[PDB]
Design an enzyme around this catalytic site. Structure first.
Site, mmCIF file in Angstrom:
data_model
loop_
_atom_site.group_PDB
_atom_site.id
_atom_site.type_symbol
_atom_site.label_atom_id
_atom_site.label_comp_id
_atom_site.label_asym_id
_atom_site.label_seq_id
_atom_site.Cartn_x
_atom_site.Cartn_y
_atom_site.Cartn_z
ATOM 1 N N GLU A 135 0.977 -1.379 0.024
ATOM 2 C CA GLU A 135 0.087 0.006 0.167
ATOM 3 C C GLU A 135 0.982 1.337 0.100
ATOM 4 O O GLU A 135 0.989 1.696 0.864
ATOM 5 C CB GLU A 135 -0.859 -0.016 1.182
ATOM 6 C CG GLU A 135 -2.143 -0.672 0.894
ATOM 7 C CD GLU A 135 -3.173 -0.990 2.083
ATOM 8 O OE1 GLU A 135 -2.843 -0.257 3.084
ATOM 9 O OE2 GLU A 135 -4.107 -1.699 1.828
ATOM 10 N N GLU A 223 -6.248 -7.567 -1.045
ATOM 11 C CA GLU A 223 -6.552 -7.210 0.329
ATOM 12 C C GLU A 223 -7.786 -6.568 0.351
ATOM 13 O O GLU A 223 -7.975 -5.586 -0.307
ATOM 14 C CB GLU A 223 -5.365 -6.442 0.951
ATOM 15 C CG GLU A 223 -5.681 -6.262 2.679
ATOM 16 C CD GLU A 223 -4.646 -5.434 3.222
ATOM 17 O OE1 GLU A 223 -3.367 -5.813 3.215
ATOM 18 O OE2 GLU A 223 -5.276 -4.618 4.012
#
Length: 297
Positions: A135, A223
């Site tokens: 991320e 995710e």
């Protein structure tokens, strides 16, 4: 299900197996391996394969927060997880799980070294999927920060592993797939990560994904959670169904966050649940019950 599907590859935007049929992988992610790696072993993965039907497992190796950068012995847990997945015939995502260290350039040398080691060991293994930067976040954007990181990490992997799937994170905690889609990597076997929490992200994020796909950029959900984005705040089942219906509509693979007994809504397991699997329904959280149902189908 790699004993069934073998070498993965990309057809257009579509992940296909070695026969060339479209495949949608479904599974679950560890929480950070330096805290909840105790739940990641051959036993628990075998129970996930057999009782939940997961076809992919994600080994979330945090870099920061007492992760690999401060304690690189955690890479033994990733190796443990890859060897379990080979034995069990499931796909395994090796996730260089950047987060507090929001620019992947921050730990770039260590990343390249780490991926050189993983690709070297596992490069001729079909089970392995590389996730090079969970991320990216902060003032971190595709053309300036992420793509040029990606090129460097991808060159090192491809020296050892010419063909397994590499998944690359995108800006704003892997939401800005539209920007990757405007300036795609040339690698044939690259996909772009999208992450969502059912409690937080709605249609604007689907729009972005449809836009990326329209440009030919493959999307993999590495995710997603049933909770809001803090990982807590309860379970949003109606929105989670909506999102899963959307991913089914585009045949997009997905991995839920997270397998642990962390006391927050998004953890799959209640405290006290075995580290080696065999969980009854009454051992699973609201989120775990829902997720297992949807991996099964």
């Amino acid at each position: 299900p790699v004993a069934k599907n073998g070498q993965l590859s990309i057809k257009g935007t579509q992940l296909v197996n070695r026969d060339g049929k479209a495949v949608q992988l479904k599974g679950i992610s560890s929480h950070g391996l330096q805290w909840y790696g105790e739940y990641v072993n051959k036993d628990s993965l075998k129970w996930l394969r057999d009782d939940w039907g997961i076809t992919v497992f994600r080994a979330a190796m945090y870099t920061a927060d007492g992760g690999y950068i401060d304690n690189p012995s955690v890479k033994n847990k990733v190796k443990e997880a890859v060897e379990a997945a080979k034995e069990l015939g499931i796909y395994v995502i090796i996730d260089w799980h950047i987060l507090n260290d929001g620019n992947p350039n921050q730990n770039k040398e260590k990343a390249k070294e780490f991926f050189k080691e993983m690709s070297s060991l596992y490069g001729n293994t079909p089970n392995v999927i590389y996730e090079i930067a969970n991320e990216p976040n902060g003032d971190v954007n595709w053309k300036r920060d992420i793509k040029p990181y990606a090129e460097e990490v991808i060159s090192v992997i491809r020296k050892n592993d010419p063909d397994n799937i590499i998944i690359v994170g995108t800006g704003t905690w892997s939401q800005d797939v539209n920007d990757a889609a405007d300036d795609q990597l040339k690698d044939a076997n690259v996909m772009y990560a999208l992450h969502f929490y059912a409690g937080t992200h709605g249609q604007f994020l689907r729009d972005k994904a449809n836009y990326a796909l329209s440009k030919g950029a493959p999307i993999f959900v590495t995710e997603w959670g049933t909770s809001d984005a803090s990982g807590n705040g309860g379970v949003f089942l109606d929105q989670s169904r909506e999102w899963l219906k959307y991913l089914d509509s585009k045949t997009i693979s997905w991995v839920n966050w997270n397998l642990s007994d962390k006391q927050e809504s998004s953890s799959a397991l209640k405290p006290g649940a075995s580290k080696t699997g065999g969980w009854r329904l009454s051992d699973l959280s609201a989120s775990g019950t829902f997720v297992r149902e949807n991996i099964l189908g």
